[PDB]
Design a protein around this ligand. Structure first.
Ligand SMILES: Cc1cc2nc3c(=O)[nH]c(=O)nc-3n(C[C@H](O)[C@H](O)[C@H](O)COP(=O)(O)OP(=O)(O)OC[C@H]3O[C@@H](n4cnc5c(N)ncnc54)[C@H](O)[C@@H]3O)c2cc1C
Ligand SMILES: Cc1cc2nc3c(=O)[nH]c(=O)nc-3n(C[C@H](O)[C@H](O)[C@H](O)COP(=O)(O)OP(=O)(O)OC[C@H]3O[C@@H](n4cnc5c(N)ncnc54)[C@H](O)[C@@H]3O)c2cc1C
Ligand SMILES: N[C@@H](c1ccccc1)c1ccc(Cl)cc1
Lengths: 339, 339
C-alpha cells in the first residue's frame, strides 16, 4: 500500500509508528509517508507540559477511559528501561488543589499512590481547602517527538514538509489510505464546527529546585484556567489560561500577568526563576475524539480515510490508545483488500 | 562576653546565629568570633546531599528525636517564604527501599504523607520487596552555609581562618565561652574514643530529570552502605559508602564503581548523566551526640566550653535543635554570673 499520515504532532507520529510496528515485514513491505506543515519543535505538542492526568469527572465516551489506561500502562512499562528519559519520560509526584471537597476521579487507582491531602499539607496552600496527592508521569512533548521521529526513521518512514490543501489532492497524489492527524486544523480539510480551538499560554522558567507538580482547579472557570506548575526534564512549565474558540496565536500580556501572578502566589520562590520563553498552543478541543473510518470518492479516485483528531487537552495522556485503535481500523481495511 | 565558636560547618554556624539571635539585645558587650580551618565549600557539611531523614532505627536518646522534630518544624516554617531556595531549602518526595519488611520509623508522622509502598510501586524496584514513600526537605549544605555566613556577617560576627591547637590557647586569648563544633576532628582538642570517622564517597552528576530521592537499605551492610540517589538544587548526589574508621580522604577506584554500578541498577537512565565531580568526606560518627557544658581552667583563666559534635550522618537533619539547646546552656552560664 501507499500510506500517508497528515500531521507530525504526538497524534500523527505515534499513530504512524503504531501501524508500522504491527503491519510491516521484509516479505510484506509497507510505504508510510508523513505529510506536515509544522514539525517539532513547532507543534502544539511541543508546547504541552506532558503530565499524565485525565479530567476530574467521568468521560462521555467510555472507550476514552480505556485509551487513557492503555497509554499509562504502555508508558509505565518503559519506566526503568535505560531510555525512558530519552523518550521524555520521567516520574513525578504532585498536588491537585481545590476550593471545595470533590469526588474522587476515575483514574485514582490508575496512578501511583493516590490519596487525599492532610491538614498540614493544606496549610502549605492557604487559598485551598481540599486536594489530592499522587505520583504519575511526565511525557515531555518536545522529547517524545524527537524520539518518535528517530524510531520512525530507522524503519524507513520518509518525511515531507507540505501544507495539504484538501484530501482530494492527496488522493490524486496516489494514496490508498490517508491517516488524518491534524488536531485543531482538521476543520479546514473538511468542516466540523464541533471542533473549537483551545488557546493556552505557558511560561517556561529555570526553577530546577521545583520537583513536584501543583495543579489548581476553579470549577467555574474550567480545565486549565487556574494556575499549574509542572517540572519538566530541563525546565519548568507555568500555565493557567485556556480560552476556547480564541484563535489568536500571539503571546499576550494579560495571560502573562495571570500565569505569573497566580503561579508566584503558589510557589513564591519563583521571583528568582529566570524566564526562558513564553509560548502559545491550540488544543484540539472537541466533545469527543473523532476516531473513525470514512470512505471518499474524489471524482476519479476512491480513497480510504481514518481520522484521529480532537484530543483537546489530553492528547499525550491518551495518544497510544488512539494510536492502537487506528491500526485496528487499518487492519479491517486490509481484510477487505486481500493482503 | 567574648565567644569563640570553633567550626564553620552547619553545626558551628547554626549554633552561632542561634546564640547571637537569642542574646545581642540583652547583653551589652556580646562579641562572637568564628575560628575555623575550613569554610564552605571545604566542610563535611558541603558533602551532604542535604536530606532531612533520621536513622531508620529508634533514637539513641529521647532528646535527639525532639531535636530532629524541632529542626523539621523550623525548616517547614520557611516553606512558603520567597527566600526558601536561597537558603538551600526546597521540598522533595521519595522512596526508601528494603530487602525485607521492617517497622515504621519514629519520624513517620514528622514528615509529610508517609506510607507503605504498594505492589505496583515495588515492581518499579525489582531488587526490593518493601519500602516507604514520603515528602521531606532538601537543605543543601553548600547553599545553607552560604546563607548562614551572610546572616552572621549582617549581624557583625567576625570569621577567622585558623587552626585551634588547643582549648588552652583560645582561653588565654580572651575567651569567656568556647563553643566546640569541630565535628569529626574534635578528638584533636580533647580525646574521644567514641567519635570516629564515617567516610563517605559521593558522585555529583548532572541529571535534572530525577525528581525523587531513592534510598536503599541492606541491614547486613549497615546504614548508607547501599546505593542512594539524592536530587539537589543544581545536581544529583549518588553515593552509598559510610565506612566507619577509614580516614583516607583520597577518592578510591573501588568505591566509585560500587556507587556507580549500584546507582545505575537503581535508575538506569544514569547511563547518560554527565559526571560533574567526585568527593569524599567524614561524618562525625559517635554512639550519641556530645552536647554538654564543661568548665576548664588553665592557670588563672577559667573558661566555659560547650561541646556540640558527633551528629554522624544526620547533622543537617538535627542541626537546629542542638543549636537551640546550646543557646539554652549559654543561657545558664549567663545567669551564673548575673547577665
Ligand atoms: C498549554 C497546553 C498544555 C497542554 N498540556 C497537556 C498535558 O499536560 N497533557 C496532555 O495529555 N495534553 C496536553 N495538551 C494537549 C496537547 O497539546 C494536544 O492534545 C496534542 O498535542 C495534540 O496533538 P496533535 O497531533 O493532534 O496536534 P498538533 O500537535 O498541533 O499536531 C498537528 C499536526 O498536523 C499538522 N497539520 C495541521 N493542519 C494541516 C494541513 N492543513 N496540512 C498539513 N498538515 C497539517 C500540523 O502542522 C502538525 O504537524 C496541552 C495543550 C496546551 C495548549
Ligand atoms: C557523604 C555524606 C552525606 C551526608 N548526607 C547527609 C544528609 O543527607 N543529611 C544530613 O542531615 N546529614 C548528612 N551528613 C552528615 C553531615 O555532613 C554532618 O553531620 C555535618 O556536616 C556535621 O557538621 P559539623 O559542623 O559537625 O562538621 P563539619 O561540617 O565538618 O564542620 C566542622 C568545622 O570545624 C572546623 N574544625 C575542626 N577542627 C578544627 C580545629 N582544630 N581548628 C579549627 N577549626 C576546626 C572545620 O574546619 C569545620 O569548619 C552526610 C555526611 C556525609 C559524609
Ligand atoms: N543520612 C544521609 C547519609 C548518607 C551517606 C553517608 C552519610 C549520611 C543521607 C543522604 C542522602 C540521602 Cl538520599 C539519605 C540519607
Amino acid at each position: 500500500m501507499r500510506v500517508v499520515v497528515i500531521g507530525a504532532g504526538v497524534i500523527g507520529l505515534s499513530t504512524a509508528l503504531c501501524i508500522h510496528e504491527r503491519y510491516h515485514s521484509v516479505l510484506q513491505p509497507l510505504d508510510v509517508k508523513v505529510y506536515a506543515d509544522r514539525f517539532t519543535p513547532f507543534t502544539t505538542t511541543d508546547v504541552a507540559a506532558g503530565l499524565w492526568q485525565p479530567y476530574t469527572s467521568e468521560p462521555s465516551n467510555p472507550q476514552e477511559a480505556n485509551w487513557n489506561q492503555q497509554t499509562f500502562n504502555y508508558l509505565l512499562s518503559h519506566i526503568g528501561s535505560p531510555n525512558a528519559a530519552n523518550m521524555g519520560l520521567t516520574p513525578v509526584s504532585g498536588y491537585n488543589l481545590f476550593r471545595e471537597a470533590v469526588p474522587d476521579p476515575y483514574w485514582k487507582d490508575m496512578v501511583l499512590g493516590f490519596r487525599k491531602l492532610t491538614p498540614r499539607e493544606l496549610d502549605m496552600f492557604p487559598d485551598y481547602r481540599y486536594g489530592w496527592f499522587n505520583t504519575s508521569l511526565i511525557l515531555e512533548g518536545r522529547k517524545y517527538l524527537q524520539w518518535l521521529t528517530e524510531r520512525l526513521t530507522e524503519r524507513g518512514v520518509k518525511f515531507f514538509l507540505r501544507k495539504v490543501e484538501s484530501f482530494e489532492e492527496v488522493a490524486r497524489g496516489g494514496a490508498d489510505v490517508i491517516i488524518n492527524c491534524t488536531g485543531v486544523w482538521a476543520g479546514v480539510l473538511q468542516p466540523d464546527p464541533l471542533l473549537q480551538p483551545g488557546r493556552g499560554q505557558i511560561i517556561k522558567v529555570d526553577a530546577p529546585w521545583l520537583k513536584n507538580f501543583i495543579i489548581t482547579h476553579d470549577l467555574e472557570r474550567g480545565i486549565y484556567n487556574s494556575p499549574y506548575i509542572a517540572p519538566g526534564l530541563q525546565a519548568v512549565t507555568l500555565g493557567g489560561t485556556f480560552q476556547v474558540g480564541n484563535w489568536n496565536e500571539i503571546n499576550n500580556i494579560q495571560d502573562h500577568n495571570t500565569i505569573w501572578e497566580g503561579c508566584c502566589r503558589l510557589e513564591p520562590t519563583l521571583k528568582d526563576a529566570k524566564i526562558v520563553g513564553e509560548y502559545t498552543g491550540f488544543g484540539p478541543v472537541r466533545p469527543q475524539v473523532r476516531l473513525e473510518r470514512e470512505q471518499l470518492r474524489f471524482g476519479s479516485s476512491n480513497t480510504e480515510v481514518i481520522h484521529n483528531y480532537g484530543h483537546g487537552g489530553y492528547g499525550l495522556t491518551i495518544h497510544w490508545g488512539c494510536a492502537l485503535e487506528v491500526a485496528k481500523l487499518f487492519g479491517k481495511v486490509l481484510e477487505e483488500r486481500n493482503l
